[PDB]
Amino acid sequence: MDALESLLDEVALEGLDGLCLPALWSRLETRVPPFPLPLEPCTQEFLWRALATHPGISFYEEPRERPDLQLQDRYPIHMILENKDGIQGSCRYFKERKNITNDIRTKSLQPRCTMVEAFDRWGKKLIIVASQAMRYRALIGQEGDPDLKLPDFSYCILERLGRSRWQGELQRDLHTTAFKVDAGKLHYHRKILNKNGLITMQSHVIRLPTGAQQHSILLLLNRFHVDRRSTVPPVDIVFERDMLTQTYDLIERRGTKGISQAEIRVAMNVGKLEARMLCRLLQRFKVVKGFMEDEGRQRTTKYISCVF
Amino acid sequence: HCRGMAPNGLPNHIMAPVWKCLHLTKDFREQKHSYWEFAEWIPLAWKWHLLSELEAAPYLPQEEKSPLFSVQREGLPEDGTLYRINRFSSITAHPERWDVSFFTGGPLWALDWCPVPEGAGASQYVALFSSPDMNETHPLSQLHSGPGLLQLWGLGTLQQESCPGNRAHFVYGIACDNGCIWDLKFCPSGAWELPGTPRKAPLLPRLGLLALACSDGKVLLFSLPHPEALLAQQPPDAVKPAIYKVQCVATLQVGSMQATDPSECGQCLSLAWMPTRPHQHLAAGYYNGMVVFWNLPTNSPLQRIRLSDGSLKLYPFQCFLAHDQAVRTLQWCKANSHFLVSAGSDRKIKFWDLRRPYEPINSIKRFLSTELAWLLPYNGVTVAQDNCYASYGLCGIHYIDAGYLGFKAYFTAPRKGTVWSLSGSDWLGTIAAGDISGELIAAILPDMALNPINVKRPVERRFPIYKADLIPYRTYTETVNHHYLLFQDTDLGSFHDLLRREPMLRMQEGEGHSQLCLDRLQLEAIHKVRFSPNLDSYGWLVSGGQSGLVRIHFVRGLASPLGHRMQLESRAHFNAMFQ
Amino acid sequence: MVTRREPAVKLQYAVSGLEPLAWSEDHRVSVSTARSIAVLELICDVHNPGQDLVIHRTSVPAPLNSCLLKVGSKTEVAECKEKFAASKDPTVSQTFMLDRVFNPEGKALPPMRGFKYTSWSPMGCDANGRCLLAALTMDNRLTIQANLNRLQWVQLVDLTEIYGERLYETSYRLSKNEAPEGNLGDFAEFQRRHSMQTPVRMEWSGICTVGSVLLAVLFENGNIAVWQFQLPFVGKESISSCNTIESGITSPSVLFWWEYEHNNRKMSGLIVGSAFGPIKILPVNLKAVKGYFTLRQPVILWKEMDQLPVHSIKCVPLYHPYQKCSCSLVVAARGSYVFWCLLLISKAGLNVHNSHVTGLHSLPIVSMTADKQNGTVYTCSSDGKVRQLIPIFTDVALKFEHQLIKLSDVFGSVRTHGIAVSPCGAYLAIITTEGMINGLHPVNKNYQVQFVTLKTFEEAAAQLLESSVQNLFKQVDLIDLVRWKILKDKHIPQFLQEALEKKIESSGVTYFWRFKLFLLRILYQSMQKEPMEEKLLEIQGKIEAVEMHLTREHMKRVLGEVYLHTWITENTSIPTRGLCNFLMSDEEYDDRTARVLIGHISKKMNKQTFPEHCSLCKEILPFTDRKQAVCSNGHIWLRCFLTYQSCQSLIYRRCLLHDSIARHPAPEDPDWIKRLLQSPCPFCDSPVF
Ligand SMILES: [Zn+2]
Ligand SMILES: [Zn+2]
């Protein structure tokens, strides 16, 4: 792949919190496949000029000199939510960092500062961030759909996984430690990413310093996937009767054995909330009564008409 | 604004839209209806083969006798005698209130007035269909194609001198093979001619053109002769409940020349005629969600072909997939016939521009919608609703702006039960609605060019025409063996003391409080309502349903000096035109 | 024959507007959609073993600003709108309030900002060698779109913004004396000022020749605006003229460009169809180019006014065998029928035949496309039936024969909202939706683009081997069938190898060497990218050998071009001596013509070195390798495969396949180098951007 493509890819694979310059050098050094261009002061100036001259690349001053990256082989998340410009991700200083783009470059994107000038002026306050289109493309890849709009929680899941590259993340640690939520809350927001197919599920084994071993789910973005080794018949709606009459007749035909709301939905060929309304109305007219039944994981409700 | 009380006991500002609607309709009909159309389609007597009673019996509706009923009237000491009348029998009009009731032999499922030209003073008819059985019911997915009978009922002429002692006469019916009929529409104008029109012996003076939405998935287009011309052709020994096998004028079906594959469209479910001159297009809604248009004059060998008996078969010129599910209603804009509105089992009302069928003008999601009305003066549409998805107690009837004015939906009448049918009168500017709860409700719309939230309490603008109840002295027989229908009618003559009179106090328990019946036939359910479209009789209304009884009423309180003024001026002009 | 290809592309939003699926000559598909246009470009990806269609996706956003047509000054319009809304007449008041052309956005009305229609330009219209996208919103914003970088789509111009201004600058009449300005307070004139500038549909001409292309826009009024664009199109600066003609057709519905050749004569005119059913050809004379001619008189193809709407038109060139001459076939979807008309110039002028092929469908046609090479037609309806329709030549004109394709056998019960035949007829793209489950409607509605095979591998191989165009990029839909066979069976089918060897032996033209390179690279992929490794190393050796061949052949052109033009003594833009060294490096160079040519060049060249410098080092870059140059500090510059200069700029042009790189043409480059830089890669015959 192109060096400068891979340069932008390394920037765009971090989130809305982006990279500091030493983090960028660290990312380029740690890249797999290896970054084609050897890092040198002339190179770092040349790559800085490539970044400065790119219109979608953007520059912030962070209120703090960021700690440098830990070597990832085996960030605090701060979700930005319902943003009116539609930009998404995590950034702890999102409202507190300031843009310095026009200070680093002209409107013609000509660099006003060299790499060493900018890093002397700001150190690790200087953050490089790729625009929303660049960041989202780096998560999607080429073959997925930019028209997809995700729940912001699910986008934050991708952004965590995306920056984690080939090393990925464990669903254990995501809910326990990153998001600090119950596994079901993560799982629900992860399911959409499986449904659209952006991520892959890996069975993985933790080995503890105690010497025990523990299963976990590894998650990897598609770009970085590498497999590790170790009966009620339906009702044709009739013209001459309203939907309540037809639905009551179904329940009365079922009688003492009753029917669930889910099987009402299937038998009536209606939406989930539409079947829910039909049940609640027949409860509210008190022509039908619901009875509990523990089935599978849940106490389901099954409904019977008050004739029985 | 205008203050004070009209002599009918409604406030003038409540009535002022009703009076205005007369003028707007008259100006429209002067410009955009016509006196003669489809001059080739005059009925031919040799196409009307009269069945014997032996031949008719399979087509006759299976109930020979009505359910037992009684009728009660506000301010008259109660009758309480149990009537029970044969198939095709009418009780006599009440001598003063002129309500009429007659039995159709089955449950009523289609109904329209014959359109009588303004001022003609003709005999006034309803054409109707009534299902073969009181309890049988037909799945939407299937082409029923079972035989049934179209009926034509003469209501006399509804002139003031004629209303006392009037009766409804079953002048004839048509034996239909093409399944049960879900909708009936007449050619809105220009079909009628004088019954006294001189014509050659094979021709008959035309009463109307009628189009049928068959459950067989095709549309039948008939030209009706005046009954007198049939009876002059008919041998006088024949059975007077005359049942005819009638050859269609045209049969309208979805397809193409050499289209071997029968269309997936399924049942036809609603019709609209093009509301303006020359009425050349007929549109139909289909179970597969399409809306389909036929250009009835079409000469083109690609759309028209003639069957060996000489009846036409017409294929459509345009279709579009308007809905995700069966199109339960069409209404076509009168003020500009480029626009059409539809509602469907996907419970969206879609306003269409027929020049640009790929995108509706507006789509408003709603509850499951059973019928629509679109009164000429008003931009929006009034929606009758099934309650199965309604926010509880907010069901009933709503008027819905097409969207430019941007008002909230005007909640014109709360109802607990599902309104099965709705009808506007363009002459009156008022709407009426039949319910499974068994009330017939009518209501007056405000001037919808002005924000309806200024109506502080719409309860002042509606009244119950009647309620049908079952009195106990799951099928029809097991019902009638233990219950009889009680019809209780309001005093329609004026709306004085309305909000104190017991029918309103009863109706205000029908709203909100009424616990819906679901455990028997719903024998009181009113399946259809139609105001008269005709300037003569413009204040008359017909209704009926699961009881199979038609009932007729005159909304005496809304007939007005402008109605009388307008009828006489139109009578003078009509008599000057035809002599 | 019909089988589904594996990926179905899911769409996020409802498919929208007129005839919503199109497949461009650039092998990009677009779906006009309620919130976007989804654009799918089919890549013959050589980097991955995935047997699927490799589809890259992007979208054009719907404009966020509701388009209002200019009909007057703001205060005058605002008073007129209030007048017509307040009018007591039902006809005036409801015609205003309902017709969305007057009410593009309102209080409760939904904003209709999605896309109505789209039309791809020919190839080469863009700023690059790619093609432009015309895109029309439902609120009548006509935009031209292009994809300059890979990621973004940018609006090059808004033509509704321009054209409304031009009309206002002429008080809404083309000739001031022909009709003086009517008062906007007249609803008929108010309506007219909308109708004359409400676009219905648009289509691009062929490339006129500096290149030019015409865009015709059809309006509700039956006016047509013909835009003339200078090429390459880069923006409003390229708009050469905007000439409006009056069709005289009422309620027009569709355009296509009839465009035809007979002996020396180049003939073209617009073919136009009404929503009420007649079809007519208009002579457009209002163009700059001298090579074209226009029809002598308007001619009418169908007269009958039967109110079957002409929903779509297509036309294809055909050499008629029995008439032994160039002819043109017009097909038009008219309700559920297909009108066909064959146009054949002779001493009689237009000889014309027409008929309706009949019984195709039990519902209106919802989309149609034609094979531009074969004239095969396909037609489709919302019941899911799709019908292939083959022209068979007859001693005069045609007869049509047709056959259903059983989409239920590949998709089950389905509704089909649109079809598009791929540019060489290899694939049919279909928009699909859940169908009737035996008389039950589906609860959930989802739109998916699905691709089905039209041609067998053997037909694709034959049409590649016997190719008239001899360009791989134009045939990548056929190439994908070859790629699919190899990735499935992990070998080149021997008859393709034998025929390609015979073509290389008998003709040897670089098209077949490019075809060899493709086949070897897919073969290398097929064996998972040990004797398998020995085979991989061997095939990589063959790839390197054919890489070297294509390099040598392109260097021969470059070195000859440098020789035939004026020698740049500063050696500014070509490593000319490096090329000469590269063309003496090996004893394999038996080509005496190249061997003497490096003599001729080395005689013509300056003896001064004029080396290329590594800009980070101010240090020479010896012409060290085929793919790259390296300085003494060991940092590396990529190689331009078009000119062998190093690509030291901070931005450079990357081939669609990432197989090769090209330099940007500088103002200091001469025209012939600028023309050399505006060329497809040596290896893949496809855009370098
Ligand atoms: Zn260097
Ligand atoms: Zn290339």
Author numbering:
A (entry chain A): 1 to 74, 98 to 253, 356 to 433
B (entry chain C): 290 to 762, 785 to 890
C (entry chain B): 50 to 258, 271 to 590, 663 to 822
Manuscript excerpt for this entry:
Transcription factor (TF) IIIC, a six-subunit protein complex with a molecular weight (MW) of 624 kDa in humans, facilitates transcription of type 1 (5S ribosomal RNA) and type 2 [e.g., transfer RNAs (tRNAs)] RNA polymerase (Pol) III target genes. TFIIIC is composed of two subcomplexes, τA and τB, that bind two gene internal DNA motifs: A-box and B-box. τA binds the A-box with low affinity and is required to recruit TFIIIB to the promoter DNA. τB interacts with the B-box with high affinity and, therefore, is essential for target DNA recognition of type 2 genes. hTFIIIC consists of τA subunits TFIIIC35, TFIIIC63, and TFIIIC102 and τB subunits TFIIIC90, TFIIIC110, and TFIIIC220. TFIIIC220 forms an integral part of both τA and τB connecting the two subcomplexes via a ~550–amino acid residue flexible linker.
We determined cryo-EM structures of hTFIIIC alone and in complex with the TRR-TCT3-2 tRNA gene. In both cases, we obtained two distinct sets of particles for human τA and τB. Hence, TFIIIC90-TFIIIC110 form, with the help of the TFIIIC220 WH1 domain and the C-terminal zinc fingers in TFIIIC90, a stable scaffold, which stabilizes the WH2 and WH4 domains. TFIIIC110 and TFIIIC90 along with the TFIIIC220-WH1, WH2, and WH4 domains form a rigid τB scaffold, while WH3 and eWH domains remain flexible. WH2 and WH4 of TFIIIC220 are an integral part of the rigid τB-core, formed by TFIIIC90-TFIIIC110 and the TFIIIC220-WH1 domain, and their conformation does not change upon DNA binding, suggesting that they provide the platform for initial DNA recognition. TFIIIC dimerization is likely to be concentration dependent because our MP measurements did not show clear indications for dimer formation at nanomolar concentrations. The observation that TFIIIC dimerizes under cryo-EM conditions should be treated with care because we were unable to evaluate TFIIIC110 dimerization in solution due to a limited amount of protein sample.
